[PDB]
Amino acid sequence: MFAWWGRTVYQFRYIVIGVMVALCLGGGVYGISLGNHVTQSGFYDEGSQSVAASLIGDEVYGRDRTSHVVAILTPPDDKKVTDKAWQKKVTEELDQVVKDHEDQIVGWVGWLKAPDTTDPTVSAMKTQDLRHTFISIPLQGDDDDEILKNYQVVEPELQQVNGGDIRLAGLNPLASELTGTIGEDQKRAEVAAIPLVAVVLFFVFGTVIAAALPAIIGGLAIAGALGIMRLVAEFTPVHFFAQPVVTLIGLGIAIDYGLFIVSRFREEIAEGYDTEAAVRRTVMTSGRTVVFSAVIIVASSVPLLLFPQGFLKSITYAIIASVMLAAILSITVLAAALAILGPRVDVERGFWGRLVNVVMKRPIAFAAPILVVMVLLIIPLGQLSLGGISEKYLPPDNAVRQSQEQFDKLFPGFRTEPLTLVMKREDGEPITDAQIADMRAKALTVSGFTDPDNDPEKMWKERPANDSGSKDPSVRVIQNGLENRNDAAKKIDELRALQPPHGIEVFVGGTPALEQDSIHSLFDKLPLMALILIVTTTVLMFLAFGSVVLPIKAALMSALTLGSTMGILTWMFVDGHGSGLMNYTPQPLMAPMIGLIIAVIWGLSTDYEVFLVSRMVEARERGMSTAEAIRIGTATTGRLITGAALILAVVAGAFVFSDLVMMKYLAFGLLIALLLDATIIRMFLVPAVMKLLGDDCWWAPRWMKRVQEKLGLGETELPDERK
């Protein structure tokens, strides 16, 4: 069935070439600016009561703008801040700041407007010696993205304050820095990635043009992917982390597929076959396999849609679009372009073959210990943690992280993240707060709460209610600080165990509650994720091939390898060994990051496996027994897998240098996992265990063989192609 597609591609090439080149070149200018529709929200679960309750409380009261940006002020030099000159100069510069722009900011809340006040809340707003003070200010807007953009617009003028200086931090500055690092990270990515891959693949494919094919293919594939994401941005927003993920993963898989096809065609044309039937051959035995790789890798990540996180949904859409577009463009246009290219395209393989044969003659021992060694690498994991995204992620040399540390060092206890207890009146009958007192006592009798004055009457009062909210008998929420955040986990359960008497409901929110509800929702759909992923991957492996037992055992082996490499990366990060090596603080992990990395590495490792099996199944179907087939297959697939692994390792280590620690986590984990899977799997033990299994390993359901060889994608046998 695939030969007909190859020959009709051969027939009329200009139409497809023009259509695809024009589509990708237009998508490039279409998506020049995709950061217009990127967001930093949607990380959590809507099905959780925490997020919905917090949002309803916010819309009924209005945003608490007190923590957008806060800047600590440093005086001229050595004159105390209790007299006129310092206050006049700093307030005059602040007047400059509010005077230059009005459409951007609301108003600077500070000790200086009313220095001669005795309110303890603003009295503790100064140090004991009173030389370090700060100024709070929000930004104009309603959602976090537009106020972040406003900050990005007007930050440097706030930077320039003082004949000394000012250090500003808070909720908005750290977010702005950690979002804006991505552009420079991507720039560094191509700058430090293109030369190495270019030189290695030039020294591999010989001439300049053969190195020009896959780089162009990857660039156009990622441009089309970003264009498709820009089109998708019409309805559902995407996270800003999607852009680097696509920009590198599409490039890597596209380079691998370009090698995948060009190295096969070159050996096809060295035999001297006819060029039309040559590109036919490249389509039938390589295009079918690359379609298998594409469909399996896209199907590996789609079960993540069961996790309702906008981050996960966005990145899965990104991966799907990027990889499938790359593969379809490859199989459609590369054969035609190579046919137009023409015939004049103008010691390691030997020892690979010798090594694999000598090993496989009796690798019994050389098979069994090895697989159990990494088994022990299971025990480093199991101490999984929960920290989400925090600020100690950023490097110590960063100005913002040290500024925020200086802020909460020289000013203790000024900012705390509360947990809200929202009480929305379904009955629409106005509240009496005697029930509120009853409930606060009811939840006070359980331990684990802070108290600033050893008197219970000083905790759990209403949150600030600016005029933007609905002044109605709707909600009287109560907030409290933290003793220690993780203990609140237990509280969560009992925080829903109590009762409002008759008709008023009660929901529980707050940032730890949002984080923990998200992680609990993730754990809720954990077993379905893994089981459906593995069963569908194995079945689709068999659907690609003529056997099921070898693919399912290979997938289980890949599961063990995934567990081992995830344990290794946990030892790298959660254990903290290597913290000084990579200049990162050992901190707990993220909620969906682990699932993302395990899914993607399952996909990549099973891709490498698919062609390894394909070469060996092609070798077996040529007509030879187990020994000759596997002997000719292992080294032949290894010569390509080594180059692919080197390419992917370079393009991944391009991202072990991004200051954001989670992106380092992703890159380092995926690269070590892909290397430890590819090299070790097809180097030592896996063909060994396959050959110990033997000739019976090539059985499959004939009742399913019926559909397999009649759907048009089980084209293994070849019609004795002429020479």
Q: What is the DSSP string of 518-578?
A: HHHHHHHTHHHHHHHHHHHHHHHHHHHSS-SHHHHHHHHHHHHHHHHHHHHHHHHHTS-TT
| Signed CA dihedral, 241, 246, 247, 252: sign only | positive
Full DSSP string of 125-174 = TB-SSS--EEEEE-BS-SSHHHHHHHHHHHHHHHHT-SSS-EEEESHHHH
Residue 685, classed as helix, strand or coil, is helix
CA angle 613, 619, 624 (to 5 degrees): 130
Evaluate whether 442 touches 386 at the Cβ level (below 8 Å): no
Task: Identify the burial level of 623 via C-beta atoms within 10 angstroms of its C-beta, where 0-12 means exposed, 13-18 middle and 19 or more buried.
Answer: exposed
3 state DSSP class of 17: helix
SS3 of 164-188: the string is CCEEEECHHHHHHHHHHHHHHHHHH
The answer to whether the CB of 138 falls within 8 A of the CB of 65 is yes
Q: What sign does the dihedral 550-555-556-558 (CA atoms) show?
A: positive
- Amino acid symbol at 647: I
CA distance 170 to 192: 33
Contact 296, 603 (CB under 8 A): yes
Using what technique was this structure determined?
Answer: cryo-EM
Residue 12 CA to residue 336 CA, distance in Å, equals 9
Distance, in Å, from the CA atom of 711 to the CA atom of 1, rounded to the nearest integer, reads 9
User: Which pair of tokens denotes residue 56?
Assistant: 């309803």
Q: Supply φ then ψ for residue 120, to 5 degrees.
A: -55, -35
Length of the chain in terms of residues written: 723
The single-letter code of the amino acid at 341 is L
User: What tokens were used for 520?
Assistant: 């609990």
Residue 201 in contact with residue 233, Cβ under 8 Å? no
Q: What's the DSSP call for residue 394?
A: S
3-state secondary structure 92-126: HHHHHHHHHCCCCECCCEECCCCCCCCCHHHHCCE
Dist CA 597 CA 474 (whole Å): 43
The Cα 647–Cα 607 span in angstroms is 15
| Euclidean distance between CA atoms 610 and 620, whole angstroms | 15
712: left (phi over 0), alpha (psi -120 to 50) or beta: left
Q: Please, is 465 exposed, middle or buried when counting C-beta atoms within 10 Å of its C-beta (0-12, 13-18, 19+)?
A: middle
Distance of alpha carbon 296 from the chain centroid: 19
The number of angstroms, rounded, from the C-alpha of 625 to the middle of its chain's C-alpha atoms is 44
H-type alpha helices, 271-330: 275-281, 288-301, 310-329
Using CA atoms, how far apart are residues 397 and 719, in angstroms rounded to an integer?
Answer: 64
Place of tokens 């597929």: 257
Which residues carry a binding-site annotation?
40-44, 607
Which spans in 206-271 are helix H? 208-232, 242-270
Nearby residues of 672 by Cβ (< 8 Å), 6 or more positions away: 565, 568, 569
* CB burial string 38-58: b at 16+ within 10 A, e below: bbbebbbbeebbbbebbebbb
Which residues are CB-neighbours of 464 under 8 A, at least 6 positions away? Answer: 61, 64, 66
Q: Which helix (H) or strand (E) holds 708?
A: helix 702-708
Q: Of 512, 442, 455, which Cα lies nearest the Cα of 484?
A: 512
Give me the phi and psi of 402, to 5 degrees please.
-65, -35
Q: Using CA atoms, how far apart are residues 678 and 181, in angstroms rounded to an integer? A: 32
Count other Cβ atoms within 10 Å, centred on residue 339.
19
SS3 category, 422 = strand
Question: CA angle at residue 264 from 258 to 267, to 5 degrees?
Answer: 135
Place of tokens 């090594």: 355
Contact (CB, 8 A) for 246 and 318: yes
Provide the resolution (angstroms): 3.7
Q: Tell me, what amino acid is at 234?
A: E
What number of other Cβ atoms are within 10 A of residue 132's Cβ?
18
Question: Pick from 207, 205, 324: which is nearest to 260 by CA?
Answer: 205
What letter represents residue 523's amino acid? F
DSSP state of 719: -
Nearest 5°: phi and psi at 73? -95, 130
* 622 touches 234 (CB < 8 A): no
Dist CA 135 CA 141 (whole Å): 19
Distance CA 74, CA 93 (A): 13
Amino acid letter, residue 304: L
- The two tokens of residue 109 are 């809340």
- DSSP-derived letter for residue 646 is H
Q: Is 91 helix (H, G, I), strand (E, B) or coil?
A: helix
Residue keyed to tokens 């509010």? 98
What would the two tokens of residue 469 be?
Answer: 């909210």
Burial class (CB in 10 A: 0-12, 13-18, 19+), 428: exposed
Binding site residue list for SQ109 = 607
DSSP letter for 479, please: E
For residue 692, the tally of other CB atoms under 10 A from its CB is 13
Contact 388, 590 (CB under 8 A): yes
Report strand pairing: 166-169 vs 109-110: unpaired
- Tokens 């890798």 identify what position? 297
Could you give the CA distance from residue 546 to residue 550 in angstroms, rounded to a whole number? 10
What would the two tokens of residue 609 be? 């496996």
Question: How far are the Cα atoms of 57, 153, 229, 331 from residue 221, in angstroms, in the given order?
Answer: 44, 33, 12, 12
**Cα distances (Å, whole numbers) of residue 716 to 246, 289, 505, 538:** 33, 10, 64, 19
